[PDB]
Copies of this chain bind each other. A is one copy, B any other.
Amino acid sequence: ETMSGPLHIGLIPTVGPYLLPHIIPMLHQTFPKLEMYLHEAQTHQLLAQLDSGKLDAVILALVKESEAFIEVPLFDEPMLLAIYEDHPWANREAVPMADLAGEKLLMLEDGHSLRDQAMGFCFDTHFRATSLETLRNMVAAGSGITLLPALAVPPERKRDGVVYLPAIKPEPRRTIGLVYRPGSPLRSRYEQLAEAIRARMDGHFD
């Protein structure tokens, strides 16, 4: 009922830390009687817990598995390219995917709906990052290039020895949605929540 009481939400590692600072302060001053509880795990994990009843809702990149549940699209997040300053394309304005296919990049470990989402798998490499940050910094160390969700990219085009430039033709995207168990009595609750978020993140990538 009324937006009051303990709410247990889980976000996947590649979303939580970059999305939260944008919507949390807003949600607090719009649902003051909402007792927040932020959890963090991989998609399989968060999905299992949602099913058990441990979690009230989960925010992640919609995938095949999140199909069994009620999915609520929050926003589409584009993915930019990340390269070290000493790279040829460092001065480009955008890079077409075609230019990548012929080269290899650093990826996150299996279990992160980013590897199993990089426009199929046209992109071996017996070293995986486990965090998006560890990944970002490998780029700084000039050990390779990678794709990163827009929200994890700083406002500056260049920073800490890394350059972030648009990926186009096609622009890689992933859909961030809110997911809750079908039937849940608190269906309206979750609903307004997804509403508030969807609102605040509208036309955020312009």
Q: Which of B38, B138, B140 contacts A21 (CB 8 A)?
A: B140
Interface size bracket, A side: 20 to 34
Q: Which residue of B lies closest to A17 (CB)?
A: B133
With a cutoff of 8 Å between Cβ atoms, the chain B residues found around residue A161 in the complex are: 24-25, 28
Judge whether B25 and A140 touch: CB under 8 Å: yes
Q: Within residues 65 to 116 of chain A, which ones have a CB less than 8 A from any CB in chain B?
A: 84
Judge whether A24 and B141 touch: CB under 8 Å: yes
Known A16-B133, A17-B134; judge A160-B39 contact (CB<8 A).
no
With a cutoff of 8 Å between Cβ atoms, the chain B residues found around residue A17 in the complex are: 131, 133-134, 137
Q: Within residues 14 to 67 of chain A, which ones have a CB less than 8 A from any CB in chain B?
A: 16-17, 20-21, 24-25, 27-28, 34-41
Q: Which residues on A are within 8 Å of B, measured CB to CB?
A: 11, 13, 16-17, 20-21, 24-25, 27-28, 34-41, 84, 127, 129-131, 133-134, 137-138, 140-143, 160-161
Known A21-B160, A24-B160, A161-B24; judge A36-B133 contact (CB<8 A).
no
With a cutoff of 8 Å between Cβ atoms, the chain B residues found around residue A20 in the complex are: 133-134, 137, 140
Tell me what chain A mostly uses at the interface: helix, strand, loop, or mixed: mixed
With a cutoff of 8 Å between Cβ atoms, the chain B residues found around residue A137 in the complex are: 16-17, 20-21, 24, 38
**Max chain B Cβ within 10 angstroms of own Cβ: one of A17, A140, A143:** A140
With a cutoff of 8 Å between Cβ atoms, the chain B residues found around residue A35 in the complex are: 143
